[PDB]
Amino acid sequence: GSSGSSGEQEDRALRSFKLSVTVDPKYHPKIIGRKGAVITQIRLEHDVNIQFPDKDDGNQPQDQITITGYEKNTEAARDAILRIVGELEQMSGPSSG
Numbered sequence: 429g430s431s432g433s434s435g436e437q438e439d440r441a442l443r444s445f446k447l448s449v450t451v452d453p454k455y456h457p458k459i460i461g462r463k464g465a466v467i468t469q470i471r472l473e474h475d476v477n478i479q480f481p482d483k484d485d486g487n488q489p490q491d492q493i494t495i496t497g498y499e500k501n502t503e504a505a506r507d508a509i510l511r512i513v514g515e516l517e518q519m520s521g522p523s524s525g
Contacts, residue, residue, distance in 0.1 A: 445499040449506050453490035455513045456480050470508050474501040478509070 460467045460480065471478050476497030481490045493509060495502045 442498055443496075445497060445502060447495040447499075447502045447506050449493035449495065449509050451491055451493060451509060451513055453481070453483065455516055456490065456493070458516060459509055459512055470505050474505040476501045476505045478505060 457480075467478060474497070476495055478493065478495045480493055481488050483490050493506075495506055497505070
């Protein structure tokens with residue numbers, strides 16, 4: 429006998445997916461949360477890893493956010509970081525109406 433029915437998975441590479449979120453370093457310390465739960469929840473929610481740049485570093489971008497994980501999941505999480513910044517910008521702003 430001889431069989432071999434199995435579709436590729438190319439996971440090794442998928443998991444090695446790195447995403448970059450362009451967002452001012454001002455909201456960076458705002459997204460993380462008070463202690464660091466908010467950001468934690470999201471990560472686990474999508475099962476990804478979100479790491480922000482260190483200002484002290486400098487050479488590296490402080491507005492760029494690195495995120496590892498399944499290209500799909502990562503995107504699902506990167507959407508949040510933005511979904512917020514949007515509301516924040518307005519927060520404490522002149523709201524007409």
